[PDB]
Design a protein around this ligand. Structure first.
Ligand SMILES: O=C(Cc1ccc(O)cc1)Nc1ncc(-c2ccc(O)cc2)nc1Cc1ccccc1
Ligand SMILES: O=C(Cc1ccc(O)cc1)Nc1ncc(-c2ccc(O)cc2)nc1Cc1ccccc1
Lengths: 230, 316, 229, 308
């Protein structure tokens, strides 16, 4: 429960700076908001600034809008936090169940108070009738992202589930390779990271979404029949 | 859903009040039709027929392109828009058609009309087309009730919803919760409408109850060869056949892309000869995400059709 | 109350299986019993043809019935109410290898005990990969999100195989839980947690026993009241 | 891991006792080589060389098939099996070479031997053959130390673990935790060993201490160009190049399927002329999973070389 020694004063915002490419449409969005370190709550003001308005459901660039905002318990080590000082990133692959794919390339950093991001969304081969281009998507339901060490980096893997307007659901398969560019102390064992990402409340409003991502790390609570493996 | 405003649209926004003040009215049978009239170049008529949940407002930014070659006239269908209510209080296809053909006589049209239809309003232009083969110069259509519906395949995920509506919960869905205006309609538009634009669309059906019935009994006219109302399936079948032969008749299909119904109907549209196809980016309410593009497409089409004072119009 | 279906709490699930990884026909099996709002079931998985089998064992361990799962009655139970007749899944597994396997099983009822009948056919497993290389310790725990889709609930889940070098090897699992009785209250959306762990540990064996817990739940975060979705 | 018994095995299970009983010892330098001997057809000798963690026992169900055409001698390497420990307690590659060639002179061999090698076993039989070129009738290898290690590519994911034992952890990895015998050995056999077959491989190293050092120090001689013991790199370099030239000398390679190292080494194998290739059931200790096919493949190969 240290903080000031890491470049980090608990109190810390975010400023996202996305640029994008879905199918054919070169857009360029942007985020502004904040949350906090140890309970790991967050929310940010995403706002298109080129290629408005969007030919595709917006909700697919929202996992692109940091795991610094994660609530870590004592019994599990926090790669993303321990990371900085200065150089840490990810590389992320989506496959939407309809067959469309997506690739995401960040670069987080620390300036004053906290984080900057340069994201780079890019999707392809989504189907006409698919929930993304049909903008059926109400939003994502929660799910637990598995997190496991592989040497110099962490791999994360969840199945994110879009709630469609019809009550049914649209799933995709995401998988993440977080690699902090300064080598960093301890690397965690294997565990879960659970999110529920929701969008705040914008009525009809001005033209901005705001979402509230908060994620807390945990361990399978059905504890082990001690005489077993693994 | 989410959606963001078009940045540069609000500059040229036309609110409802600004539209309605540009509309005309006339009595029609036991009621009246609010409507909009270019007026000049009346040697031709291009009628634009909106469909469910919309009204003539649907066309506000499309029409300014066609106006300088042909008269444009854009009704609000009966019980919708600022038009009058319907006598029996009913609103099925033929109810809409009786009131609409009446209004076609009180207008001093040329012999051969140019039609621009969307959704059910293209079914209205298709029906009149079948019983009026000699009064038709061209049909522009889009998101249209082409043919009967045999299976829900390349169709949007809206079975169930349909049967749910042909059921005493369509009352509660439509009459009380304004399902097709307040959800389905901004649902099927890419940009986010400005509050006052949506205020146009909502102005008719703002109050709960029987002023919402056309938005309910319109989809209840949907031609499922299984379970759909038989007289409607017989109409579209009849004009589909006539439309498949209509070599005579020049047409234009604006595909929406993704579109809503566009995907399931592009192939039916292809079964109509003398059709030139085009494509604009939208959902179902294409007009609300690309009227300047549709605008000029319909333009060069009417200009090209209107040299019927010589040769054909689709070399070769 | 769990009379109805013709099914007692604890119940003996004889679990015959039929398999084919790659080149190799193998006709395993499994004898067991378990509980139903416990979520806990044990099986003495015997291998009964194609010994020795040429691939890490655990790929067929998820093949060995979500009848066994703590469904708190605030989330409806698809599988319990598919009985007496039972149900069926079709599972599609995709290993990060690129290798794949489909799991086809019928969970009938035949003398007061769960006669399941699993089928399992894998291939495109890579030689230098942790399944041919038999480097799998076992399955980590998992969280299978469930959602309704007409007369079906599909399950989707990310399984991680823990390897001898501590590293992990994961895969992705989509399951078509189609009933065969028509069942009322279909469920909303929720996850089933598993810890599946092997426990006849260090034996002279001839057979492996695993014990799976299975609980349905929702979350520990919960929404800003604002919601959406 | 998990693993099921091949059930067809126990009908013919040769326990440790009923292996060692059938061996004869002989004094060699300050100690001795327990070893097996077919004895009979002695106008040829085919010498069998097990590698790390194992012993002459690893060739039991292989060796009968080819006993009827030549004398076969299967040693335990020094410090392994019932063979006796090394004088200085050092166990590097040449140590094993010292006690083994020394032992050779004691056997009244033909002056044209056939070596059959496995693991580091193959390394001994390669580096002998380089230095005794006039006396190799033929070579047979498998899971072999063919050439040096630059590219980890087609290789099992065993780096870092190598770094973990060329580390000072390895003492408490292997002496303390008998890692290669208890964790690694059954891990890399397809079938499960009947609990007494395991009892065999385990008994030599049944206790903590430097008595396990052979299993720790064999892999610390891994011929890695970067970071590997230079002399070992130089040895394998040298017998490779000769091996690569050994056009006149009949060879036979046996990759295992999947294999373990076979995958990564097999390219290097046919960089040696005159190699007959074959393929058999299994992982690294292939003798556990396909001995009989291994058996008759080595038999029919020797038959060929003995026809001129
Ligand atoms: O019934 C029609 C008219 C129609 C047009 C072309 C065609 O091929 C078939 C029918 N349309 C319709 N029919 C059904 C639905 C519909 C039903 C449920 C749902 O979730 C989404 C759309 N939508 C629509 C379009 C629409 C109308 C009004 C407001 C918004 C959209
Ligand atoms: O050191 C050697 C000998 C060797 C053989 C061929 C070759 O191309 C390079 C080296 N082998 C080795 N080198 C490393 C490993 C090894 C390392 C880490 C690990 O987790 C598992 C095996 N295993 C082994 C062999 C072995 C011994 C006992 C049981 C099974 C296999």
């Amino acid at each position: 429960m240290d903080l000031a020694k890491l470049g980090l004063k608990e109190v810390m915002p975010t400023k996202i700076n996305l640029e994008g490419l879905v199918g054919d449409h070169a857009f360029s969005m942007e985020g502004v908001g904040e949350g906090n370190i140890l309970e790991g709550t967050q929310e940010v003001k995403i706002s298109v600034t080129k290629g408005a308005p969007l030919p595709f459901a917006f909700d697919i660039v929202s996992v692109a809008f940091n795991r610094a905002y994660t609530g870590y318990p004592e019994e599990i080590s926090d790669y993303f936090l321990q990371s900085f000082p200065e150089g840490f990133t990810y590389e992320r692959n989506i496959r939407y169940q309809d067959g469309g794919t997506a690739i995401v390339k960040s670069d987080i950093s620390l300036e004053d108070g906290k984080f900057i991001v340069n994201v780079d969304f890019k999707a392809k081969d989504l189907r006409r009738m698919g929930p993304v281009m049909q903008q059926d998507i109400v939003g994502m339901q929660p799910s637990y992202e598995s997190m496991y060490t592989n040497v110099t980096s962490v791999i994360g893997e969840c199945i994110i589930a879009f709630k469609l307007q019809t009550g049914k659901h649209f799933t995709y398969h995401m998988r993440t390779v977080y690699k902090s560019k300064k080598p960093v102390e301890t690397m965690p064992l294997y565990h879960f990271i659970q999110h529920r990402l929701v969008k705040t409340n914008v009525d009809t409003a001005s033209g901005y979404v705001v979402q509230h991502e908060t994620a807390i790390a945990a361990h399978s609570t059905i504890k082990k029949i001690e005489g077993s493996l693994p | 859903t989410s959606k963001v405003y078009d940045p540069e649209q609000r500059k040229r926004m036309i609110t409802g009040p600004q539209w309605w003040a540009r509309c005309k009215q006339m009595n029609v049978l036991d009621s009246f039709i609010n409507y909009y009239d270019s007026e000049k170049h009346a040697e031709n008529a291009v009628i634009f027929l909106h469909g469910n949940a919309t009204s003539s407002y649907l066309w506000r930014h499309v029409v300014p392109h066609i106006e300088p070659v042909a008269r444009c006239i854009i009704p609000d269908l009966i019980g919708m828009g600022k038009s009058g209510k319907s006598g029996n209080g009913s609103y099925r296809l033929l109810d809409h058609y009786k009131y609409l053909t009446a209004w076609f006589e009180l207008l001093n049209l040329p012999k051969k009309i140019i039609f621009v239809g969307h959704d059910w309003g293209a079914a209205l232009a298709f029906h009149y087309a079948y019983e009026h083969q000699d009064r038709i110069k061209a049909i522009v259509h889009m998101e249209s009730v082409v043919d009967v519906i045999e299976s829900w395949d390349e169709w949007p995920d809206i079975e169930e919803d349909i049967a749910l509506i042909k059921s005493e919960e369509g009352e509660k869905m439509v009459l009380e919760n304004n399902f097709f205006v307040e959800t389905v309609l901004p649902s099927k538009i890419m940009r986010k409408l400005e509050p006052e634009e949506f205020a146009a669309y909502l102005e008719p059906f703002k109050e709960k109850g029987e002023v919402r019935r056309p938005t309910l009994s319109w989809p209840r006219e949907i031609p499922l060869v299984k379970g759909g109302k038989p007289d409607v399936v017989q109409i579209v079948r009849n004009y589909n056949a006539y439309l498949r032969a209509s070599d005579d008749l020049p047409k234009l299909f604006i595909e929406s892309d993704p579109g809503f119904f566009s995907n399931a109907i592009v192939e039916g549209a292809k079964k109509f000869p003398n059709t030139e196809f085009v494509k604009v980016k939208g959902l179902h309410f294409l007009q609300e995400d690309a009227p300047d593009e549709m605008g000029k497409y319909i333009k060069s089409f009417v200009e090209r059709v209107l040299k019927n004072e010589q040769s054909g119009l689709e070399v070769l």
